Design an enzyme around this catalytic site. Structure first.
Site, PDB file in Angstrom:
ATOM      1  N   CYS A 379      51.992  41.544  38.262  1.00 26.26           N
ATOM      2  CA  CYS A 379      52.511  42.501  37.678  1.00 26.26           C
ATOM      3  C   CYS A 379      52.741  43.816  38.604  1.00 26.26           C
ATOM      4  CB  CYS A 379      51.810  43.430  36.449  1.00 26.26           C
ATOM      5  SG  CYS A 379      52.442  44.496  35.238  1.00 26.26           S
ATOM      6  N   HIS A 507      50.203  38.326  33.243  1.00 24.52           N
ATOM      7  CA  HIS A 507      48.829  38.229  33.540  1.00 24.52           C
ATOM      8  C   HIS A 507      48.229  36.836  33.432  1.00 24.52           C
ATOM      9  CE1 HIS A 507      47.921  42.408  34.263  1.00 24.52           C
ATOM     10  NE2 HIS A 507      48.984  42.678  33.818  1.00 24.52           N
ATOM     11  N   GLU A 509      45.494  35.451  34.558  1.00 19.22           N
ATOM     12  CA  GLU A 509      44.122  35.462  34.543  1.00 19.22           C
ATOM     13  C   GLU A 509      43.994  35.393  33.134  1.00 19.22           C
ATOM     14  OE1 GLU A 509      46.352  38.115  35.646  1.00 19.22           O
ATOM     15  OE2 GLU A 509      45.187  40.053  35.251  1.00 19.22           O
TER      16      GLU A 509
END
Ligand SMILES: Nc1ncnc2c1ncn2[C@@H]1O[C@H](COP(=O)(O)OP(=O)(O)OP(=O)(O)O)[C@@H](O)[C@H]1O
Ligand SMILES: Nc1ncnc2c1ncn2[C@@H]1O[C@H](COP(=O)(O)OP(=O)(O)OP(=O)(O)O)[C@@H](O)[C@H]1O
Ligand SMILES: Nc1ncnc2c1ncn2[C@@H]1O[C@H](COP(=O)(O)OP(=O)(O)OP(=O)(O)O)[C@@H](O)[C@H]1O
Ligand SMILES: Nc1ccn([C@@H]2O[C@H](COP(=O)(O)OP(=O)(O)OP(=O)(O)O)[C@@H](O)C2(F)F)c(=O)n1
Ligand SMILES: Nc1ccn([C@@H]2O[C@H](COP(=O)(O)OP(=O)(O)OP(=O)(O)O)[C@@H](O)C2(F)F)c(=O)n1
Ligand SMILES: Nc1ccn([C@@H]2O[C@H](COP(=O)(O)OP(=O)(O)OP(=O)(O)O)[C@@H](O)C2(F)F)c(=O)n1
Ligand code: NA
Ligand code: NA
Ligand code: NA
Ligand code: NA
Ligand code: NA
Ligand code: NA
Lengths: 535, 535, 535
Positions: A379, A507, A509
């Protein structure tokens, strides 16, 4: 089959392991073939964590449906394959907001609106909504038993237990059993007092989860059983472990899931934890070691990057690499220079908002690109990478985001509505939240790693790559690796003349798990290992 | 002026440091010239600890007046020079025994005898009687606030505070502030909950002593103050320290004695802790090191030998010798043999009752004597030394105590009323408790250590050296170094063909202090240091 | 089958109806053919109530075996036919006395004696010993839940519930539901708070007995159920009634005995309350009315004469006579004279100790005799009747008891070891307690009332009729109606020139029941009715 509820409460202290314990128990029950889910009841007044500071609260987790939630839902998704949504997390703020709107509208027909039954009914309704169509629903109650903030939640679940019946409801209470250095004993007294506090609110615990820096021996578990109206086999030791992925196994070996399935009259096979046994094996037997720099603006609270730190660890598992994560303040790159980025096998710049520490991240992106150090931008990490390239390769001086310098000549990053070129010329729902399909470009590094033309990743941003200035940056050598939507927004960028340079808007993750890993983090940790070897 | 009371309570857990904190605070107040005393209120039902085994709640401490008391009174005498007596310790058992006695003979004049006022009145009477004409009386309440066993003590001291008034009464409450490894924070929540528990019993704490494995930072202390109606300056950090002698200094540095003197309107000079600074300096600056083996039957709970362990440390201070105390089970000597007594610079055999592990101690005394290893025997330690010398030098085969083998041919140790020779011929309150004068023999180690013809030491035993068999043991080379009373009972024996072999009936550990040391222990540790070098 | 326990506790206030509720429930279970018993656990420190004055906690009840007990055991015997003994009543004093005795002589083998387990073990042992082989054992816990004094009893019964299991243990908790005049509503809040207090001690109540000055309506019972984890059908209304004999019927009508039998798996027939219906019918349908004066020294607390007052009511049931009981202070007879004995159909002088108010009773006995007013004297009531007749008929001026005037010339009442004549000449465990056989004289009122040559009644006295002075009083016209033992002690006396004048040493009130009445009280109330009409 009737839906069963496990209410998970904490006594003595917070930071106790309620979320991990709930996620770990859910993992055992899912491994027995049961349809299981978890929900988090947070006692804070924020309607949701959307507005909450990472430094104060930890990371804002994002679900597929685009809900901004407690980081515990990150733990949930990493332990079970049930997808979380808005229904899996709600706050006191949400409950009071909903009841106040129903009241001001006139839904209560002139009634006095009370903590009981109106607040408690609103809590129960959201628990049932989240729980419906599951064998077992674990309900994590935030806060500590004895505190004011969680009393409405505790009164609500007390009522639920009576209504639904004790054949389909269990109370699982975590306590601290602290070690006293001088006498060399672990102490049950806090457990004794916490259980009396929980009883005084109207809840008899069925299961006691005893958290300690070591195993709680049989004498202490028997003493807890004696004073708390709990059978000895329902008093469970949950010691501090070097890996939370061991906890499902530790709980299974004490027969916790057997006890639960017996109480709920669930006939299901023994828990197959072979995938967890594999995770534990991989972690305990790394062949190589890498140091990876995480350069961000929230390092003062590591939990600000909970899912990123876990995703890197999961990258380690798949490569059999021990990942040393070095948290580097980006403002220390602004002050002391790129000297503090030396001895890193890879660099990761995670998500963030606001200009504070951003110039440091831009410098970090440049250092990683120029020194051929593996780079992953998430990001804000992909913004600073685009800015770096624009400034130092495409010769677009002082190129920035409109978030940081609104009236800059080269807004390479800006809102779709703000999109302008270097001459101020323009073309003839701003916040992107949750799952979105992204098209990967053929022959891109990410296309190879993801091993598919399209991927689904989760967004939390409004500032996009400015398409009006993109062509100039593309001509200067930068590659677009992924796009999405009608407006063909840039999702992934790559620097090709580099061993491993990837930056994404989403994202990744949030979709990484210990069992299934993540293609991008696995690739990144591998690149880090290959770099470490060449030195 | 009016007598002032500091009521010392503990929350969250026991083994918290109530005794050490009370003793340490008393040491500060005594160093300001105040007349200060301490008393221990024990919630157990035993009329006194005379009947209690050492492995249960530690050593039975004996005062000058022959009272059998909690080992806390040992902490008191080692920290202040005010001598303890029967009225500085009482149990729930003592209180109920006294009230039941008064009730059965009709002292309450047909009244219903109740916890309030009859039990609480009995408690207040003993607190006042022990408080006498002292400036400050510290009243340590055993048990943990919130438990059943201490409620009458807490109700009693609440009533005292109201009656006497808050200008002459303070509530000092100890709590646990535990460290959480995962979050790396110390937790105030147990303090918050413990103070609410104390308040629910009717007591507002004035001072909070926060026990932790590290200093409690300003933020945590400020939080405790906010939730507990306690001024920030009255929230005191008492971390785990490497030496309890440092605690007076640590409490003084946080202004605890200033706060107390201000509340009690006590105009007295600043505390001079020079004597404690000296003890700390001595301890921190040893010249050499010794390993002293303590061979006994209660080593499973070290607090069984609390005063003996402290006395050995005091012996070290006076010689600048660092004493490594090795606790050795006397039963392991019976099993594995003398091999486990290897690498010892000295051997101490402390007090005990019952035959279990005694033969191991007799073997231990033999090893120490034959290999010229410094030996100190206390009570049972002297018995086994006399039995050793009787069997292996005086040729009295199977010589023993009547306590262990009642019908042995050579009862070298026996009750005065059991005294018989080898042929069964005879002469013509056996329990000796508290301070008794002992006459020392002109040419003995002890006569030159004590540097006086007479000494006062404390007894707790009924089994005496048999005077009928003594003369034969004296002829075999054993020396009587000390005697007492009309019956000329043997108090001290020495083996003169040995660098340092002394054994006494009395408990010299009960008169040892860190500031003044003890002549016998100083001599023993010196002999240990000389043996260490000689080797 | 396994013995079942119903633990009966009280919340909010004492004087709540624990004894009457326990006794009333026991009467229902006995009417279902169950083998049922009751025991009283008293939190006061008195070893037994033998020493306690009547004006303190009411009459000292005496069992067959001669135990001095709480008056609740009187309620028990008046409601069930299971005879009470020493093991149906014990105090905290008894428990601590027993544990202290065991501790001092070394039965706990050097253990630290603690509230748990040593005090609680002692309580559980006495509950089991009293519970024997009964189907149902009701265990009444004295004091109010939340007070210090009952906590060991509550911890003990909590442990019993866990050990025995909840298939054979029930918690029945009484609360106050008070009426608020201004709002005209009964309040459930004290019940809500009392149940939370009971839970904080570790006990979930199974049954709530709601005491109020009126029926607790369905809405209030439903509210109590909602907040207390108690089924609506287990929330029982027990209003203030004009007759305690109605309570078994009121509890049965709400299904209390059905709930208990279901929980305990007891297959037994529906309760036949015909005997109680008959008592109620008799009471509600009197034919005539009498005013009986009770002249004593303890009238300030009517419960001082609990069994005597009940026995007079039972006398009324058997004659269909409504007995107006007028409590008259015997000291007012000393001050204001005989004028206050006017308008009485009969006079009863009950038991007592000490000289205070005795002369008023002697004056009272004189008035009853001289004016041919029916008289019943119990214990002290007989002494004053013998003294009256001695002084005013047998011409023994200043005749008295040695209890009151030790060195009087005519000790007509004295200890057997004090027996002397007027000249000081003599003959040649004084305390008589419990059931003793009495031989009745052929031509006496009592012989034709009891309709047997021998009777069994209960004693509580040491001061006997002086046999040395008796013959002279017999010659003056007094009749011995009853004697006992080898020493032929005078048990009953009668004045034959009188419609009804009887006085006894024993306490006939202790064997009177509402169902079976008592021959002596039935006769006394009949004589009162005949005097009323005759006038
Ligand atoms: N058994 C365990 N061993 C080691 N660390 C653990 C264990 N259980 C939990 N932790 C760690 O402790 C921290 C707190 O755990 P978790 O967030 O589940 O607790 P919680 O009770 O939900 O805390 P809070 O409510 O304060 O957020 C995390 O860093 C987690 O990884
Ligand atoms: N500040 C401290 N640092 C290190 N050790 C300490 C400290 N305070 C107390 N201790 C040790 O902790 C143990 C318990 O201390 P103490 O006897 O004063 O506690 P207590 O609360 O009276 O315990 P209990 O209630 O179990 O009798 C002892 O070994 C003592 O030396
Ligand atoms: N339902 C009722 N209606 C009227 N009077 C009642 C009722 N229940 C009890 N009583 C009366 O109330 C008084 C107290 O009753 P009881 O002795 O059973 O109570 P308790 O709770 O055992 O009292 P305490 O704890 O003070 O000994 C007595 O006078 C009894 O007759
Ligand atoms: N509700 C209770 C429970 C216990 N106790 C009393 O608590 C006392 C024991 O106190 P400890 O040794 O500090 O506590 P532990 O229970 O062993 O817990 P830890 O594991 O923290 O050591 C007994 O005398 C008692 F009597 F048992 C009490 O008075 N009231
Ligand atoms: N009486 C109270 C006190 C506090 N809280 C709530 O307690 C919450 C904080 O919980 P934490 O972080 O576990 O507590 P801490 O006090 O910081 O204790 P520690 O030093 O052990 O960390 C707030 O939302 C609150 F709201 F403040 C509460 O609800 N009722
Ligand atoms: N544990 C509880 C229980 C209730 N209430 C709050 O209690 C309030 C009602 O107060 P009331 O009218 O005095 O209580 P009642 O229960 O009707 O008792 P009574 O029978 O004595 O009248 C609600 O707003 C509440 F919210 F329900 C509460 O805050 N916490
Ligand atoms: Na958490
Ligand atoms: Na303990
Ligand atoms: Na102590
Ligand atoms: Na906190
Ligand atoms: Na009663
Ligand atoms: Na109400």
């Amino acid at each position: 089959m009737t839906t069963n509820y496990i209410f998970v409460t904490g006594g003595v202290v917070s930071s106790l392991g309620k979320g991990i314990a709930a996620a770990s128990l859910a993992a055992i029950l899912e491994a027995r073939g049961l349809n299981v889910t978890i929900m988090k009841l947070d006692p804070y007044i924020n309607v949701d964590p959307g507005t909450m500071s990472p430094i104060q609260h930890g990371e804002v987790f994002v679900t597929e449906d685009g809900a901004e939630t407690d980081l515990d839902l990150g733990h949930y998704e990493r332990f079970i394959r049930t997808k979380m949504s808005r229904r899996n997390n709600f706050t006191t703020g949400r409950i009071y907001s909903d009841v106040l709107r129903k009241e001001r509208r006139g839904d209560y027909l002139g009634a006095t609106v009370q903590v009981i039954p109106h607040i408690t009914n609103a809590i129960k309704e959201r628990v049932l909504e989240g729980g419906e169509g599951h064998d077992v629903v674990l309900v994590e109650i935030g806060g500590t038993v004895g505190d004011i903030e969680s009393l409405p939640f505790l009164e609500a679940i007390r009522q639920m237990a009576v209504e639904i019946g004790r054949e389909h409801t269990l109370f699982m209470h975590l306590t601290l059993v602290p070690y006293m250095a001088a006498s060399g004993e672990v102490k049950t007294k806090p457990t004794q007092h916490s259980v009396k506090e929980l009883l005084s609110i109207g809840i008899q615990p069925d299961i006691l989860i005893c958290r300690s820096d070591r195993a709680v021996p049989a004498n202490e578990r028997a003493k807890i059983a004696l004073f708390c109206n709990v059978p000895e086999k329902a008093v469970i030791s949950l010691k501090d472990v070097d890996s939370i992925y061991k906890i499902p196994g530790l709980l299974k070996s004490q027969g916790l899931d057997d006890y639960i399935c017996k109480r709920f009259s669930l006939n299901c096979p023994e828990a197959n934890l072979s995938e967890w046994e594999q995770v534990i094996f991989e972690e305990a037997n790394p062949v190589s070691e890498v140091t990876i720099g995480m350069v961000g603006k929230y390092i003062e609270l590591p939990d600000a990057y909970k899912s990123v730190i876990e995703a890197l660890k999961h990258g380690g598992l798949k490569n059999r690499v021990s990942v040393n994560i070095k948290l580097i303040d980006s403002q220390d790159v602004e002050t002391r220079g790129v000297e503090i980025l030396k001895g890193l096998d890879a660099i990761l710049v995670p998500g963030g908002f606001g200009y504070r520490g951003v110039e440091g991240m831009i410098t970090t992106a440049r250092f990683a690109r120029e020194n051929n150090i593996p780079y992953l931008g998430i990001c804000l990490g992909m913004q600073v990478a685009l800015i770096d390239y624009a400034r130092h390769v495409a010769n677009m001086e002082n190129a920035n985001s409109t978030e940081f310098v609104p009236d800059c000549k080269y807004p390479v990053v800006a809102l779709i509505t703000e999109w302008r070129d270097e001459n101020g010329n323009v073309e003839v729902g701003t916040m992107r939240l949750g799952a979105q399909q992204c098209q990967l470009v053929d022959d891109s590094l990410v296309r190879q790693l993801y091993n598919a033309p399209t991927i689904v990743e989760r967004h939390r941003h409004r500032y996009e790559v400015n398409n009006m200035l993109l062509k100039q940056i593309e001509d200067a050598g930068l590659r677009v690796a992924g796009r999405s939507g009608d407006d063909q927004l840039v999702e992934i960028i790559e620097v090709p003349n580099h061993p491993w340079f990837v930056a994404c808007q989403f994202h990744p993750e949030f979709t990484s798990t210990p069992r299934d890993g993540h293609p991008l983090f696995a690739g990144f940790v591998k690149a880090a290992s290959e770099f470490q070897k060449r030195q």
